[PDB]
Amino acid sequence: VRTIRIYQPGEYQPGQLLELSPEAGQHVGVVLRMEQGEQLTLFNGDNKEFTASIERVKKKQVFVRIASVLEVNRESPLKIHLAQAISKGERMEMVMQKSAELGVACITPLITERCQVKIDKEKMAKKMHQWLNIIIGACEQCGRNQIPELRQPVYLDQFVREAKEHLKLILHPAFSKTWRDYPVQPPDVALIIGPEGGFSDEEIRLTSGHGFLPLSLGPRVLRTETAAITALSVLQAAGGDL
Amino acid sequence: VRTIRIYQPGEYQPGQLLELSPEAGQHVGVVLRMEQGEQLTLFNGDNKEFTASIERVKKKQVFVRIASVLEVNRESPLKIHLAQAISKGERMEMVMQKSAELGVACITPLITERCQVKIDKEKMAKKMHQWLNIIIGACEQCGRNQIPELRQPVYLDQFVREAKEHLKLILHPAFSKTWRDYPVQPPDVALIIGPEGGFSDEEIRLTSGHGFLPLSLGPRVLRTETAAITALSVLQAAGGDL
Ligand SMILES: C[S@@+](CC[C@H](N)C(=O)[O-])C[C@H]1O[C@@H](n2cnc3c(N)ncnc32)[C@H](O)[C@@H]1O
Ligand SMILES: C[S@@+](CC[C@H](N)C(=O)[O-])C[C@H]1O[C@@H](n2cnc3c(N)ncnc32)[C@H](O)[C@@H]1O
């Protein structure tokens, strides 16, 4: 059995008793049901890991004894900024979880013409909150000791205007080329993946106007959430740490 | 936009009047509520797309008239054999779907040491039916006109003994070799992926001894079902049609 990893930002040092955050301590003592003397690895989002053991469980609060600090970085050298068309429900959560597993540096939810979602300020905020916790959960899972940035949703126009990454790719069949036709390598990539219905010709004219080049992923139509993970897999395997 | 795709095995020809299989009629007649006169693209599993029109719908009996046949092959030239350790519930469903979207040729459900599944012949024949249907659904969605082969569950020990693919790979986070260290090319490749708990040292011992060579997918630990998506994406990108 592997050791449990818990996100706990902030600075602290070995030998120090730490009171776990509300969510951290509620994860450990309540959800995981762990007891005094059990072991834990904490990470702070800054690429450090802290070995620890549970000493006192008082209600939902959890106190942990730090054993040692170690600098452990599992980031890819290829920084990909995913711009993912918003899908309803579980598929978007799937993308949030697995794109973090695949080293994604930064995620922008994208509102595009053929997205089928209701854009409510209250609703969007809840989604953003839920998405960030899924990301942190995936980072506890996969070993990343730095949380990827989850940026506020923007329309296609804004994102394509502000995009400054050195390689800029959109998943779209027309005039597309495979990963071998592009210079996939650090520093960074902007990657647009669209909604189930795809993109309008006007949207392609706008993205193509701002330097986004068309990338294919084989002759089979991939689902929207499949396409994110496949695209990240292929780009990391080409010019990252896969 | 594009016509609804329905898997319909068997032999049939342009100009025939054809009664759809019960599951196909259920899908067309009840789920999708399709009307007489609407169009279907049937595929029989032999890289043929039949254009047909719905001539009568009576609950879940559906009769179509075949108009034309077109040979259309969306199979990867790399034949990948995924042997996926069996995981709980919806994780394995994701593997079946994504791997068919990704062009997998053959799937073997795999029983490894740390799998936590009750070996029940009633459960397992049922589960094999549910996995098959997820696969078939995936070919309908993604455009494969040929169903991947779904084999019976076998234990790791037997699978590794019997494997005959020209390139054999075992996926484990504590490896360092990447896809670039191997001749990933036709005809075929066998790939072994572990459960949520991974492989034991004994299993790594066993598979290495039977010629499965070590493959890593970067320094982050992927969920069992993420690893199937990433591994197939990378292998199709390297030697298939991605
Ligand atoms: C990834 S798809 C999202 C929709 C997905 N089919 C679903 O069910 O949710 C978004 C757009 O990406 C494009 N796309 C999908 N697979 C592709 C591929 N293999 N090569 C190039 N573009 C692709 C398609 O044009 C699609 O309209
Ligand atoms: C959740 S992982 C198993 C974790 C477990 N603690 C272990 O490593 O022994 C499930 C499967 O995904 C595959 N996998 C996950 N990350 C991988 C990586 N970075 N490189 C190669 N295989 C990986 C392995 O085949 C593993 O058995």
Numbering used by the authors:
A (entry chain A), B (entry chain B): 3 to 244
Task: Copy the relevant paper text.
The methylation of U1498 located in the 16S ribosomal RNA of Escherichia coli is an important modification affecting ribosomal activity. RsmE methyltransferases methylate specifically this position in a mechanism that requires an S‐adenosyl‐L‐methionine (AdoMet) molecule as cofactor. The protein comprises an N‐terminal PUA domain and a C‐terminal SPOUT domain. The latter is responsible for protein dimerization and cofactor binding.
Here we report the structure of Apo and AdoMet‐bound Lpg2936 from Legionella pneumophila at 1.5 and 2.3 Å, respectively. Comparison with similar structures suggests that Lpg2936 is an RsmE‐like enzyme that can target the equivalent of U1498 in the L. pneumophila ribosomal RNA, thereby potentially enhancing ribosomal activity during infection‐mediated effector production. The multiple copies of the enzyme found in both structures reveal a flexible conformation of the bound AdoMet ligand. Isothermal titration calorimetry measurements suggest an asymmetric two site binding mode. Our results therefore also provide unprecedented insights into AdoMet/RsmE interaction, furthering our understanding of the RsmE catalytic mechanism.
